Amino acid sequence: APAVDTAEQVYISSLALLKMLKHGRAGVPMEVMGLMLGEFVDDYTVRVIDVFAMPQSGTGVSVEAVDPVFQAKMLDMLKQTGRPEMVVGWYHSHPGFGCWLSGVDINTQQSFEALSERAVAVVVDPIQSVKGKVVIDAFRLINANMMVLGHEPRQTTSNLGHLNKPSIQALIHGLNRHYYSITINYRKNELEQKMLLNLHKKSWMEGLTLQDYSEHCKHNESVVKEMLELAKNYNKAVEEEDKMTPEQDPKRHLEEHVDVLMTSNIVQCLAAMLDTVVFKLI
Amino acid sequence: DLYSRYKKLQQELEFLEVQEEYIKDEQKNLKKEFLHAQEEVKRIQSIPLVIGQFLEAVDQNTAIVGSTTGSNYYVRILSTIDRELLKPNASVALHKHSNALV
Amino acid sequence: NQTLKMIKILSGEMAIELHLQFLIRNNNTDLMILKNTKDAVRNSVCHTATVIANSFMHCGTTSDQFLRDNLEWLARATNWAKFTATASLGVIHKGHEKEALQLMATYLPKDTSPGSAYQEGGGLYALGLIHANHGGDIIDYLLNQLKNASNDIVRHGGSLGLGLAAMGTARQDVYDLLKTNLYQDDAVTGEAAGLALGLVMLGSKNAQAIEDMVGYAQETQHEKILRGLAVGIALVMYGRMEEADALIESLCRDKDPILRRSGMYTVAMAYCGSGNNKAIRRLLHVAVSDVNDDVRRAAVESLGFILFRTPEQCPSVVSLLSESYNPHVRYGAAMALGICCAGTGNKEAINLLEPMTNDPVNYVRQGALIASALIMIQQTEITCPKVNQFRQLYSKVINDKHDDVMAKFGAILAQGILDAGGHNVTISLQSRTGHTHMPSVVGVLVFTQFWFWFPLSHFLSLAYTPTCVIGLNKDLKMPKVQYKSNCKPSTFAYPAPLEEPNFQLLDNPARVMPAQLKVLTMPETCRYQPFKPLSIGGIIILKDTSEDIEELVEPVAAH
Amino acid sequence: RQYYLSKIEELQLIVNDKSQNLRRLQAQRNELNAKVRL
Ligand SMILES: [Zn+2]
């Protein structure tokens, strides 16, 4: 009997992640859900090419919350657009609950896996995904028969599935007992990276725009006053050092103050001088 | 003897140069990563934070905080915090989702 | 007449035969360690690891007594685990070419809830394993099987067997068949197809094969195919030195991280042992600068292949990588030290690896255990003080019921490596006379790919080079000749099985540690005389000085 | 002959200088990596 490998990965597309995050935040504090489009490239790869949201329903996030008519028209009409991808799986946002499946979630996932054996049930936490960490996990299931007979839910052939550790929260809510966490990998090609880099690419202008000279002088005065006080603290600490065998330092704070003054002042001088040269009447 | 020693000396100098350039490159990359880590630590001090009372210190890096939500937690102190200002019943701000004494 | 004998010698049949006889006669594997290990195995990962370790210690000795005793415990393997076990069967029977087909037929296929395609593929791959680098007679049978193979798993096992048996032959028919299988565009067989293309055209520098493989790697979508093609691209350009700079640049600038890993592996293979400062510079820059963890790990482990010829300079460069914040860099530094100082028992390398055996990251611990086992192979307590301590550490990790599963896997494989071949083999990337042992290098490199595919771990058996001194007569038979080791017996003796004069006599064949070869002489009273000075050792011809009737070493039976 | 010894001593002093510098740089990278890891 074939068993899904522990090296199986869910290649979440970049825009798939973006849409999931935006829709999850929009639904806060309610729970949202949507369908995940892509293709099962092989037994060790699930490529979530795209995702489309689903209308918020009074049921919540269940298998009655998937509108068959809405699902249909969206599927045929996206196929017309140029996205003829089979529905890979579904997603729903647990706002602040962490990533796991509640009993209704496993019920809906069973409904989904009735359609196809390979079908994931990724979830995302829209509020715990603060700047930096993104709290998203992908679980498929554990069939009861495989577990009760004692066989491990997934065969192992590599360390890929053991690189990351399952969390206590998910573990208590049935992880590794009713469903397994599938490692999530983000397909991000160079083009999308370069385009995303424009979000904080400032301009060709601020590289030549001088900071306000009055504000520059006030910042410099404040920093040199702080350097005063830090230097007095340094002198007192060093005077103590002599009456001290090996047994906040004014020195470090002084050092990063020096570094900030360095960068700000040198940049201002150099920028002003380039502005003198290139921005010339001639 | 003499020539072999000369060749070994030149080879050792060359290897020293390789290690030198490697260490310089790694120093640059480690400085970048250190800046990124400092940025992450600073960002963990963002808002909103729940107020709590610093009940007692346990270790150099963990403490017991009584959150104003009416529950007491054994949480982790941020490293950058001045320990001397951490006095009993001092009001402290805790991370919203981890209650760490931020 | 005499020319036929010379052809017989060069064809390798006699050499593998005498190596096999040495392994069988000097088979001193301890079964108590495996008994304790199988006592301390709970999950399928450790079960497969124990199978692999049993293969490692009985590599080429044809002693499957442990498997025969614990068939009931072996039956717990399933799917790729069963495939790996059926493959390890071949590693047990390394060099047994004569009855290969018959013995594989003794494990004839059957029909059950597993389609037994895993068993067939494992049998094919094990058959390729028996005829590693010497598949000249099995090539046609395996070609016909692969062409007639219908199942995917059978295709994967057969492709692995074809590549490993035809390693480096650069034959065109096998290359075309495996290219067809690769173009069938399937993930399970794609790894085997790419590895087999790497093996068959090993060190060939062929433009056609490299172009086809790189193009497919840039065209396909299955990641397993990507890993297979990466290692294949690495092996195609083995030992080509500066001829590979164009490919190295082309793979370094590739956007796909797998291709960058392939470039790092190619840097390792092309400059294996050269110590080229430019290759070291490129590897270190990539290892400290690349954004993908796997590529950093590959780049930093490639330093082992680059610097194995100068192991004393190697900890000096890898020590700082050993402490890097990146766990993948730490694991790669461990593997680089293990590959780099393999079979040398370097003191500085172990002083580096000792604190790294308790790293918080689990796979770093597994890699540290693997590398320590590689370095301490065949080493003794007086030769290296920390060997017994590391044995205790391995036993503790196996017997710790809370340590992580990957760490347990690494410790199982470490136990298997440490006592490999019944303490009769070592890891020597360099040859006896100073050549780069291509089978050892290829086997070690592919063994490092166990991170991505467990059945690839059996490739390490290629690196198992016996530490034997074979004396031969003019007949090429084996006279009963005894050699004198001018050292304390415990200095290079077998490790004490689990529960004083200044010289020792050693029979023919003589299992001699590479350090023991220095102090091993031959008594004057013996009527023979070494031809080449016995310090280099290995297969040594002894010139007889008397006409007294020869007593030959009685040839031991198989198994 | 004496040319060999002169080259050897020059390379030896250069190697001592570069080794001492490499030890210094290794220490700096050690402390910085410790900071990053912490
Ligand atoms: Zn839910």
Coordinates of all heavy atoms in Angstrom, one line a residue, chain C residues 450-520:
Chain C
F450 N 22.2 10.8 1.2 CA 21.2 10.1 2.0 C 20.3 11.1 2.7 O 19.2 10.8 3.0 CB 21.9 9.3 3.1 CG 22.3 10.1 4.3 CD1 21.5 10.0 5.5 CD2 23.4 10.9 4.4 CE1 21.8 10.7 6.6 CE2 23.7 11.6 5.5 CZ 22.9 11.5 6.6
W451 N 20.7 12.4 2.8 CA 19.8 13.4 3.3 C 18.6 13.5 2.5 O 17.5 13.8 3.0 CB 20.6 14.8 3.3 CG 19.8 16.0 3.7 CD1 18.8 16.6 3.0 CD2 20.1 16.8 4.8 NE1 18.3 17.7 3.7 CE2 19.1 17.8 4.8 CE3 21.0 16.7 5.9 CZ2 19.0 18.8 5.8 CZ3 20.9 17.7 6.9 CH2 20.0 18.7 6.8
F452 N 18.6 13.3 1.2 CA 17.5 13.4 0.3 C 16.9 12.1 -0.1 O 15.7 12.1 -0.5 CB 17.9 14.2 -1.0 CG 18.4 15.6 -0.7 CD1 19.7 15.9 -0.7 CD2 17.4 16.6 -0.5 CE1 20.1 17.2 -0.5 CE2 17.9 17.9 -0.3 CZ 19.2 18.2 -0.3
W453 N 17.6 11.0 0.0 CA 17.1 9.7 -0.4 C 17.8 8.6 0.4 O 19.0 8.4 0.2 CB 17.3 9.5 -1.9 CG 16.4 8.5 -2.5 CD1 16.8 7.5 -3.4 CD2 15.0 8.3 -2.4 NE1 15.7 6.7 -3.8 CE2 14.6 7.2 -3.2 CE3 14.0 9.0 -1.7 CZ2 13.3 6.8 -3.3 CZ3 12.7 8.6 -1.8 CH2 12.3 7.5 -2.5
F454 N 17.1 7.9 1.3 CA 17.7 7.0 2.1 C 18.4 5.8 1.4 O 19.5 5.4 1.7 CB 16.7 6.4 3.1 CG 16.5 7.3 4.3 CD1 15.6 7.0 5.3 CD2 17.3 8.4 4.5 CE1 15.5 7.8 6.4 CE2 17.2 9.3 5.6 CZ 16.3 8.9 6.6
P455 N 17.7 5.2 0.4 CA 18.4 4.1 -0.4 C 19.7 4.5 -1.0 O 20.5 3.6 -1.4 CB 17.4 3.6 -1.4 CG 16.3 4.7 -1.4 CD 16.3 5.3 -0.1
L456 N 20.0 5.8 -1.2 CA 21.3 6.2 -1.7 C 22.4 6.0 -0.7 O 23.6 6.1 -1.1 CB 21.3 7.7 -2.1 CG 20.4 8.1 -3.2 CD1 20.7 9.5 -3.7 CD2 20.5 7.1 -4.4
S457 N 22.1 5.6 0.5 CA 23.2 5.4 1.5 C 24.0 4.2 1.2 O 25.2 4.1 1.7 CB 22.6 5.3 2.9 OG 21.7 4.1 3.0
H458 N 23.5 3.2 0.5 CA 24.3 2.0 0.2 C 25.5 2.3 -0.7 O 26.4 1.5 -0.8 CB 23.4 0.9 -0.4 CG 22.3 0.4 0.5 ND1 22.5 0.4 1.8 CD2 21.1 -0.1 0.2 CE1 21.4 -0.1 2.4 NE2 20.6 -0.4 1.4
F459 N 25.5 3.5 -1.3 CA 26.6 3.8 -2.2 C 27.9 4.0 -1.4 O 29.0 3.9 -2.0 CB 26.3 5.1 -3.0 CG 25.6 4.9 -4.3 CD1 24.3 4.5 -4.3 CD2 26.3 5.1 -5.5 CE1 23.7 4.3 -5.6 CE2 25.7 4.9 -6.7 CZ 24.4 4.5 -6.7
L460 N 27.8 4.2 -0.1 CA 29.0 4.3 0.7 C 29.9 3.0 0.7 O 31.1 3.1 0.9 CB 28.7 4.7 2.1 CG 29.8 4.9 3.1 CD1 30.8 5.9 2.5 CD2 29.3 5.4 4.5
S461 N 29.2 1.9 0.4 CA 30.0 0.6 0.4 C 31.1 0.7 -0.7 O 32.1 -0.1 -0.5 CB 29.1 -0.5 0.1 OG 29.0 -0.8 -1.3
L462 N 31.0 1.6 -1.7 CA 32.1 1.7 -2.6 C 33.4 2.2 -1.9 O 34.5 1.8 -2.2 CB 31.7 2.6 -3.8 CG 30.4 2.4 -4.4 CD1 30.3 3.2 -5.7 CD2 30.2 0.9 -4.7
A463 N 33.2 3.1 -1.0 CA 34.4 3.7 -0.2 C 35.0 2.7 0.7 O 36.1 3.0 1.2 CB 33.9 4.9 0.5
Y464 N 34.4 1.5 0.9 CA 34.9 0.5 1.8 C 36.1 -0.2 1.1 O 35.9 -1.1 0.4 CB 33.8 -0.4 2.2 CG 32.9 0.1 3.3 CD1 31.7 -0.6 3.6 CD2 33.2 1.3 4.0 CE1 30.9 -0.1 4.6 CE2 32.4 1.8 4.9 CZ 31.2 1.1 5.3 OH 30.4 1.6 6.2
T465 N 37.3 0.3 1.4 CA 38.5 -0.3 0.8 C 39.2 -1.2 1.9 O 39.6 -0.7 3.0 CB 39.5 0.8 0.4 OG1 40.1 1.4 1.5 CG2 38.8 1.9 -0.4
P466 N 39.3 -2.5 1.7 CA 39.8 -3.4 2.7 C 41.3 -3.0 3.1 O 42.1 -2.6 2.2 CB 39.8 -4.7 2.0 CG 38.8 -4.6 0.9 CD 38.9 -3.2 0.4
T467 N 41.5 -3.1 4.4 CA 42.9 -2.9 4.9 C 43.5 -4.3 5.1 O 43.6 -4.8 6.1 CB 42.8 -2.1 6.2 OG1 41.8 -2.6 7.0 CG2 42.6 -0.7 6.0
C468 N 44.0 -4.8 3.9 CA 44.6 -6.1 3.9 C 45.9 -6.1 3.1 O 46.2 -5.3 2.3 CB 43.6 -7.1 3.2 SG 43.2 -6.7 1.5
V469 N 46.7 -7.1 3.5 CA 48.0 -7.3 2.8 C 48.0 -8.8 2.3 O 48.1 -9.7 3.1 CB 49.2 -7.1 3.8 CG1 50.5 -7.5 3.1 CG2 49.2 -5.6 4.2
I470 N 47.9 -8.9 1.0 CA 47.7 -10.2 0.4 C 49.1 -10.6 -0.2 O 49.6 -10.0 -1.1 CB 46.6 -10.2 -0.7 CG1 45.5 -9.3 -0.3 CG2 46.1 -11.6 -0.9 CD1 44.8 -9.7 1.0
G471 N 49.6 -11.8 0.3 CA 50.8 -12.3 -0.3 C 50.5 -13.4 -1.3 O 49.6 -14.2 -1.1
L472 N 51.1 -13.3 -2.5 CA 50.8 -14.2 -3.6 C 52.1 -14.9 -4.1 O 53.2 -14.3 -4.0 CB 50.1 -13.5 -4.7 CG 49.1 -12.5 -4.4 CD1 48.6 -11.7 -5.6 CD2 47.9 -13.2 -3.7
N473 N 52.0 -16.1 -4.6 CA 53.1 -16.8 -5.2 C 53.2 -16.6 -6.7 O 52.4 -15.9 -7.2 CB 53.0 -18.3 -4.8 CG 51.8 -19.0 -5.3 OD1 50.9 -18.3 -5.8 ND2 51.7 -20.3 -5.2
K474 N 54.1 -17.3 -7.3 CA 54.2 -17.2 -8.8 C 52.9 -17.8 -9.5 O 52.6 -17.4 -10.6 CB 55.4 -17.9 -9.3 CG 56.8 -17.2 -9.2 CD 57.0 -16.7 -7.8 CE 58.5 -16.3 -7.6 NZ 58.7 -15.7 -6.3
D475 N 52.3 -18.7 -8.8 CA 51.0 -19.3 -9.3 C 49.8 -18.3 -9.1 O 48.8 -18.5 -9.7 CB 50.8 -20.6 -8.5 CG 49.7 -21.5 -9.1 OD1 48.6 -21.0 -9.4 OD2 49.9 -22.7 -9.3
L476 N 50.0 -17.3 -8.3 CA 49.0 -16.3 -7.9 C 48.1 -16.9 -6.8 O 47.2 -16.2 -6.4 CB 48.2 -15.8 -9.0 CG 48.9 -15.0 -10.2 CD1 48.0 -14.7 -11.3 CD2 49.6 -13.8 -9.6
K477 N 48.3 -18.1 -6.4 CA 47.6 -18.6 -5.2 C 48.2 -18.0 -4.0 O 49.1 -17.1 -4.0 CB 47.7 -20.2 -5.2 CG 47.2 -20.8 -6.5 CD 45.8 -20.3 -6.8 CE 45.4 -20.8 -8.2 NZ 44.3 -20.1 -8.8
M478 N 47.7 -18.5 -2.8 CA 48.0 -17.8 -1.5 C 48.8 -18.7 -0.6 O 48.2 -19.6 0.0 CB 46.7 -17.4 -0.8 CG 46.5 -15.9 -0.9 SD 44.9 -15.4 -0.3 CE 45.4 -14.9 1.4
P479 N 50.1 -18.6 -0.6 CA 50.9 -19.4 0.4 C 50.6 -19.0 1.8 O 50.3 -17.8 2.1 CB 52.4 -19.1 0.0 CG 52.3 -17.7 -0.6 CD 51.0 -17.6 -1.3
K480 N 50.8 -20.0 2.7 CA 50.6 -19.7 4.1 C 51.8 -19.0 4.7 O 52.7 -19.6 5.2 CB 50.4 -21.0 4.9 CG 49.1 -21.8 4.5 CD 48.1 -21.8 5.6 CE 48.5 -22.6 6.8 NZ 47.5 -22.5 7.9
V481 N 51.8 -17.7 4.5 CA 52.9 -16.8 4.9 C 52.5 -16.0 6.1 O 51.4 -15.4 6.1 CB 53.4 -15.9 3.7 CG1 54.6 -15.1 4.2 CG2 53.7 -16.7 2.5
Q482 N 53.4 -15.8 7.1 CA 53.1 -15.1 8.3 C 53.9 -13.8 8.3 O 55.1 -13.9 8.0 CB 53.3 -15.9 9.5 CG 52.4 -17.1 9.6 CD 52.5 -17.7 11.0 OE1 53.3 -17.4 11.8 NE2 51.6 -18.7 11.3
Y483 N 53.3 -12.7 8.6 CA 53.9 -11.4 8.6 C 54.1 -10.9 10.1 O 53.3 -11.3 10.9 CB 53.1 -10.3 7.9 CG 52.6 -10.8 6.5 CD1 51.4 -11.4 6.4 CD2 53.4 -10.7 5.4 CE1 50.9 -11.9 5.2 CE2 53.0 -11.2 4.1 CZ 51.7 -11.8 4.1 OH 51.3 -12.2 2.8
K484 N 55.1 -10.1 10.4 CA 55.5 -9.7 11.7 C 55.1 -8.2 11.9 O 55.6 -7.4 11.1 CB 56.9 -10.0 12.0 CG 57.4 -9.3 13.3 CD 58.9 -9.5 13.5 CE 59.3 -9.0 14.9 NZ 60.8 -9.2 15.1
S485 N 54.2 -7.9 12.8 CA 53.9 -6.6 13.2 C 54.8 -6.1 14.4 O 54.6 -6.6 15.5 CB 52.4 -6.4 13.5 OG 52.2 -7.0 14.8
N486 N 55.7 -5.3 14.1 CA 56.7 -4.8 15.1 C 56.1 -3.7 16.0 O 56.5 -2.6 16.0 CB 58.0 -4.4 14.5 CG 59.2 -4.6 15.3 OD1 59.2 -4.4 16.5 ND2 60.3 -5.1 14.7
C487 N 55.0 -4.1 16.7 CA 54.3 -3.2 17.6 C 53.5 -4.1 18.6 O 53.4 -5.3 18.5 CB 53.3 -2.4 16.8 SG 52.0 -3.3 16.0
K488 N 53.1 -3.4 19.7 CA 52.3 -4.0 20.7 C 51.0 -4.6 20.0 O 50.4 -3.9 19.2 CB 51.9 -3.0 21.8 CG 51.2 -3.7 23.0 CD 52.1 -4.4 23.9 CE 51.8 -4.2 25.3 NZ 50.3 -4.4 25.6
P489 N 50.6 -5.8 20.4 CA 49.4 -6.4 19.7 C 48.2 -5.5 19.8 O 47.4 -5.4 18.9 CB 49.2 -7.7 20.4 CG 50.6 -8.1 20.9 CD 51.2 -6.8 21.3
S490 N 48.0 -4.9 21.0 CA 46.8 -4.0 21.2 C 46.8 -2.7 20.4 O 45.8 -2.0 20.4 CB 46.6 -3.8 22.7 OG 45.6 -2.8 22.9
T491 N 47.9 -2.4 19.8 CA 48.0 -1.1 19.1 C 47.1 -1.1 17.9 O 46.5 0.0 17.6 CB 49.5 -0.8 18.7 OG1 50.3 -1.2 19.8 CG2 49.7 0.7 18.5
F492 N 47.0 -2.2 17.2 CA 46.2 -2.3 16.0 C 45.3 -3.5 16.0 O 44.9 -4.0 14.9 CB 47.0 -2.2 14.7 CG 48.0 -1.1 14.7 CD1 49.3 -1.2 15.2 CD2 47.7 0.1 14.2 CE1 50.2 -0.2 15.2 CE2 48.5 1.2 14.1 CZ 49.8 1.0 14.6
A493 N 45.0 -4.0 17.2 CA 44.2 -5.3 17.2 C 42.7 -4.9 17.0 O 42.3 -3.8 16.9 CB 44.3 -5.9 18.6
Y494 N 41.9 -6.0 16.9 CA 40.5 -5.8 16.8 C 40.0 -5.1 18.1 O 40.6 -5.3 19.2 CB 39.8 -7.2 16.7 CG 39.6 -7.6 15.3 CD1 40.2 -8.8 14.8 CD2 38.8 -6.9 14.4 CE1 40.0 -9.2 13.5 CE2 38.7 -7.3 13.1 CZ 39.3 -8.5 12.6 OH 39.1 -8.9 11.3
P495 N 38.9 -4.3 18.0 CA 38.3 -3.8 19.3 C 37.8 -5.0 20.1 O 37.4 -6.0 19.6 CB 37.2 -2.9 18.8 CG 36.9 -3.4 17.4 CD 38.2 -3.9 16.8
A496 N 37.8 -4.8 21.4 CA 37.4 -5.9 22.3 C 35.9 -6.2 22.1 O 35.1 -5.3 22.2 CB 37.6 -5.5 23.8
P497 N 35.6 -7.4 21.7 CA 34.2 -7.8 21.5 C 33.3 -7.5 22.7 O 33.8 -7.7 23.9 CB 34.2 -9.3 21.1 CG 35.6 -9.5 20.7 CD 36.5 -8.6 21.5
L498 N 32.1 -7.1 22.5 CA 31.2 -6.7 23.6 C 30.8 -7.9 24.4 O 30.7 -9.0 23.9 CB 30.0 -5.9 23.1 CG 30.2 -4.5 22.7 CD1 28.9 -3.7 22.6 CD2 31.2 -3.8 23.6
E499 N 30.5 -7.7 25.6 CA 30.0 -8.8 26.5 C 28.7 -8.4 27.2 O 28.3 -7.3 27.3 CB 31.1 -9.0 27.6 CG 31.3 -7.9 28.6 CD 32.2 -6.7 28.0 OE1 32.8 -7.0 26.9 OE2 32.2 -5.6 28.5
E500 N 53.5 -8.6 28.1 CA 53.0 -8.4 26.8 C 54.1 -8.0 25.8 O 54.7 -7.0 25.9 CB 51.8 -7.4 26.8 CG 50.9 -7.4 28.0 CD 51.4 -6.7 29.2 OE1 52.6 -6.4 29.2 OE2 50.6 -6.3 30.0
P501 N 54.3 -8.9 24.8 CA 55.4 -8.7 23.9 C 55.3 -7.4 23.1 O 54.2 -6.9 22.9 CB 55.4 -10.0 23.0 CG 54.1 -10.5 23.2 CD 53.6 -10.2 24.6
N502 N 56.4 -7.0 22.5 CA 56.4 -5.8 21.6 C 56.2 -6.1 20.1 O 56.5 -5.3 19.3 CB 57.7 -5.0 21.8 CG 58.9 -5.9 22.0 OD1 58.9 -7.1 21.5 ND2 59.9 -5.5 22.8
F503 N 55.7 -7.3 19.8 CA 55.5 -7.7 18.4 C 54.4 -8.7 18.3 O 54.0 -9.3 19.3 CB 56.8 -8.2 17.7 CG 57.0 -9.7 17.9 CD1 56.8 -10.5 16.9 CD2 57.4 -10.2 19.1 CE1 57.1 -11.9 17.0 CE2 57.6 -11.5 19.3 CZ 57.5 -12.4 18.2
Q504 N 53.9 -9.0 17.1 CA 52.9 -10.0 16.9 C 53.1 -10.5 15.5 O 53.6 -9.9 14.6 CB 51.5 -9.3 17.0 CG 50.4 -10.3 16.9 CD 49.0 -9.7 16.9 OE1 48.9 -8.5 17.3 NE2 47.9 -10.4 16.6
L505 N 52.6 -11.8 15.3 CA 52.7 -12.4 14.0 C 51.3 -12.4 13.3 O 50.3 -12.6 14.0 CB 53.2 -13.9 14.1 CG 52.3 -14.9 14.8 CD1 51.5 -15.7 13.8 CD2 53.2 -15.8 15.6
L506 N 51.3 -12.1 12.0 CA 50.0 -12.0 11.3 C 50.1 -12.9 10.1 O 51.1 -13.0 9.3 CB 49.8 -10.5 10.8 CG 50.0 -9.4 11.8 CD1 49.8 -8.1 11.2 CD2 49.1 -9.7 13.1
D507 N 49.0 -13.7 9.9 CA 49.0 -14.7 8.8 C 48.6 -14.0 7.5 O 48.4 -12.8 7.4 CB 48.0 -15.8 9.2 CG 48.3 -17.1 8.5 OD1 49.1 -17.9 9.1 OD2 47.8 -17.4 7.4
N508 N 48.5 -14.9 6.4 CA 48.0 -14.4 5.1 C 46.6 -14.8 4.9 O 46.3 -16.0 5.0 CB 49.0 -15.0 4.0 CG 48.9 -14.2 2.8 OD1 48.9 -12.9 2.8 ND2 48.9 -14.9 1.6
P509 N 45.7 -13.9 4.6 CA 45.9 -12.5 4.4 C 46.1 -11.8 5.7 O 45.6 -12.2 6.8 CB 44.5 -12.0 3.8 CG 43.6 -13.2 3.9 CD 44.2 -14.2 4.7
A510 N 46.8 -10.6 5.7 CA 47.1 -9.9 6.9 C 46.2 -8.6 6.9 O 46.3 -7.7 6.1 CB 48.6 -9.5 7.0
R511 N 45.3 -8.6 7.9 CA 44.5 -7.4 8.1 C 45.3 -6.4 8.9 O 45.7 -6.6 10.0 CB 43.2 -7.7 8.9 CG 42.7 -6.6 9.8 CD 41.7 -7.1 10.8 NE 41.2 -6.0 11.6 CZ 41.6 -5.8 12.9 NH1 42.4 -6.6 13.5 NH2 41.1 -4.8 13.6
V512 N 45.7 -5.3 8.2 CA 46.7 -4.4 8.7 C 46.1 -3.0 8.6 O 45.7 -2.5 7.5 CB 48.1 -4.5 8.0 CG1 49.2 -3.8 8.7 CG2 48.4 -5.9 7.7
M513 N 46.1 -2.2 9.7 CA 45.7 -0.8 9.7 C 46.7 0.0 8.9 O 47.9 -0.3 8.8 CB 45.6 -0.3 11.1 CG 44.9 -1.1 12.2 SD 43.2 -1.8 11.8 CE 43.7 -3.4 11.2
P514 N 46.2 1.1 8.2 CA 47.2 1.9 7.4 C 48.3 2.4 8.2 O 49.4 2.6 7.7 CB 46.3 3.0 6.9 CG 45.1 3.0 7.8 CD 44.9 1.6 8.2
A515 N 48.1 2.7 9.5 CA 49.2 3.1 10.4 C 50.1 1.9 10.8 O 51.3 2.0 11.0 CB 48.7 3.8 11.6
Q516 N 49.4 0.7 10.9 CA 50.1 -0.5 11.2 C 51.1 -0.9 10.1 O 52.1 -1.6 10.4 CB 49.1 -1.6 11.6 CG 49.8 -2.9 12.1 CD 48.7 -4.0 12.3 OE1 47.7 -4.0 11.6 NE2 49.0 -4.8 13.3
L517 N 50.8 -0.5 8.9 CA 51.6 -0.9 7.7 C 53.1 -0.4 7.9 O 54.0 -1.0 7.4 CB 51.0 -0.4 6.4 CG 50.2 -1.4 5.6 CD1 48.8 -1.4 6.1 CD2 50.2 -0.9 4.2
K518 N 53.2 0.7 8.6 CA 54.6 1.3 8.8 C 55.5 0.4 9.6 O 56.6 0.2 9.2 CB 54.5 2.6 9.5 CG 54.1 3.8 8.5 CD 54.0 5.1 9.3 CE 55.2 5.3 10.3 NZ 56.5 5.1 9.6
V519 N 55.0 -0.2 10.7 CA 55.8 -1.0 11.6 C 55.7 -2.5 11.3 O 56.1 -3.3 12.1 CB 55.4 -0.7 13.0 CG1 55.4 0.9 13.2 CG2 54.0 -1.3 13.4
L520 N 55.0 -2.9 10.2 CA 54.9 -4.3 9.9 C 56.0 -4.7 9.0 O 56.2 -4.1 7.9 CB 53.6 -4.5 9.1 CG 53.3 -5.9 8.5 CD1 52.8 -6.8 9.6 CD2 52.4 -5.8 7.4

